[PDB]
Amino acid sequence: SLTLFHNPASPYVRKVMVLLHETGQLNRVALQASQLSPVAPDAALNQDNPLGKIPALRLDNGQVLYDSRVILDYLDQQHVGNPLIPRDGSARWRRLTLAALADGIMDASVLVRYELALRAPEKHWEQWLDGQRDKIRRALAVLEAEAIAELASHFDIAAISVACALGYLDFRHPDLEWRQDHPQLAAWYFEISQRPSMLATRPP
Amino acid sequence: SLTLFHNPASPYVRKVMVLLHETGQLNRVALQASQLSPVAPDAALNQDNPLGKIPALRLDNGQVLYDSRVILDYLDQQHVGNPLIPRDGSARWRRLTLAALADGIMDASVLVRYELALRAPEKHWEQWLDGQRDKIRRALAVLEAEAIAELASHFDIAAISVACALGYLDFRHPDLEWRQDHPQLAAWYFEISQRPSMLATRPP
Numbered sequence: 001s002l003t004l005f006h007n008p009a010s011p012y013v014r015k016v017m018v019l020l021h022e023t024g025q026l027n028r029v030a031l032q033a034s035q036l037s038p039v040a041p042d043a044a045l046n047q048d049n050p051l052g053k054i055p056a057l058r059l060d061n062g063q064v065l066y067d068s069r070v071i072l073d074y075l076d077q078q079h080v081g082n083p084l085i086p087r088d089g090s091a092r093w094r095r096l097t098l099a100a101l102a103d104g105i106m107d108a109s110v111l112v113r114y115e116l117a118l119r120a121p122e123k124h125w126e127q128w129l130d131g132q133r134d135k136i137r138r139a140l141a142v143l144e145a146e147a148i149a150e151l152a153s154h155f156d157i158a159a160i161s162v163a164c165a166l167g168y169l170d171f172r173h174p175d176l177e178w179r180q181d182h183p184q185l186a187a188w189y190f191e192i193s194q195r196p197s198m199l200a201t202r203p204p
Numbered sequence: 205s206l207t208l209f210h211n212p213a214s215p216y217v218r219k220v221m222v223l224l225h226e227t228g229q230l231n232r233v234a235l236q237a238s239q240l241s242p243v244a245p246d247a248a249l250n251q252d253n254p255l256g257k258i259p260a261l262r263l264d265n266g267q268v269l270y271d272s273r274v275i276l277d278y279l280d281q282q283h284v285g286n287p288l289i290p291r292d293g294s295a296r297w298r299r300l301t302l303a304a305l306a307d308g309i310m311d312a313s314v315l316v317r318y319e320l321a322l323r324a325p326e327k328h329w330e331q332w333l334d335g336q337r338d339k340i341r342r343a344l345a346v347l348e349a350e351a352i353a354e355l356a357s358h359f360d361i362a363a364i365s366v367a368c369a370l371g372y373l374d375f376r377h378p379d380l381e382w383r384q385d386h387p388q389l390a391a392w393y394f395e396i397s398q399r400p401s402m403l404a405t406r407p408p
């Protein structure tokens with residue numbers, strides 16, 4: 001069977017968990033708990049993913065896949081349902097670009113979390129923090145437009161990725177109050193939060 | 205024709221350029237010079253690229269793709285013959301994981317560069333910087349121990365990504381010596397550095 005390095009905070013892990021739920025493949029995956037940060041290595045994880053990041057997926061044959069987008073691609077090709085990642089043509093490119101937009105939000109969000117929670121306050125750099133927050137805000141604006149119609153078309157790779165990014169803002173960055181100025185996105189997210197796969201994968 | 209939002213220092217742009225050379229698709233592309241935004245997002249927007257993604261690829265009919273991994277997939281699917289990303293088989297996820305290893309080297313390398321170059325010295329956090337350097341070192345060790353034959357077998361998505369990551373280490377982090385403990389990787393890099401795709405795309 002498969003083994004996924006996991007913890008319930010990670011929104012990248014959450015993408016994987018949501019895809020597993022949606023595709024009926026939770027039964028294939030043992031969870032290996034990991035607590036970690038860039039200054040607190042997990043030695044067991046590092047033996048499998050030298051980058052020291054989660055998610056990482058150990059296959060039945062012992063090979064390891066990372067990062068999250070590689071794992072999601074692998075898992076999407078294992079089931080016979082409709083794919084969550086379009087296999088060809090225009091949709092493939094469009095939906096993977098929205099997924100990358102969402103990953104960029106997560107990347108900035110995690111960096112701001114680590115600076116605020118781990119770095120000594122006297123070493124915080126406010127202009128850096130605000131630059132990351134502004135990159136998140138600009139991406140949210142594009143998502144507001146996408147929430148008009150494109151986002152809701154399918155609960156697929158793009159929708160999962162965006163949903164996990166918004167859930168992570170709620171969890172670690174409520175001060176960004178993303179709903180206040182993004183009502184269309186707020187409505188979309190309120191709906192997709194009720195999906196069983198989202199309810200089962202919320203952070204602590 | 206296509207437009208690539210381009211910067212010559214970025215190793216992520218470099219992967220795209222190398223793949224365009226290697227697949228014979230430079231005759232498709234016009235470059236549009238674009239400024240990296242390490243701290244505050246750029247105040248000058250191109251309306252097709254409101255998030256200032258670099259690389260970003262604007263298709264013949266105006267859709268814009270990003271990030272580099274999405275662009276690489278798109279471009280690889282636009283030519284016939286030998287794909288540089290395997291379409292299926294164990295090799296697909298093996299080569300994509302090796303590419304992700306390389307992207308992780310680049311990610312750690314950029315974080316270290318931007319902190320060292322842009323953040324005030326008194327606010328540098330050495331244990332954080334070393335945690336990122338340790339990702340790089342562990343990843344190099346995996347390449348040397350596990351990936352030499354793989355890299356040599358095909359100058360593909362994995363090899364291009366690794367090559368660009370090593371070029372970026374030489375460019376921004378020559379203090380991080382990597383050739384001594386990874387002699388096979390060093391020899392391979394010396395060889396592939398002479399490919400026209402690599403010579404043409406070296407950072408300034």
Ligand SMILES: N[C@@H](CCC(=O)N[C@@H](CS(=O)O)C(=O)NCC(=O)O)C(=O)O
Nearest residue numbers: 009010011012037038053054055067068
């Ligand atoms: N490109 C990767 C990013 C994973 C990541 O940053 N994960 C964080 C945990 S966070 O999501 O809770 C992680 O592993 N941090 C540890 C570290 O950076 O040392 C992916 O898409 O899987």
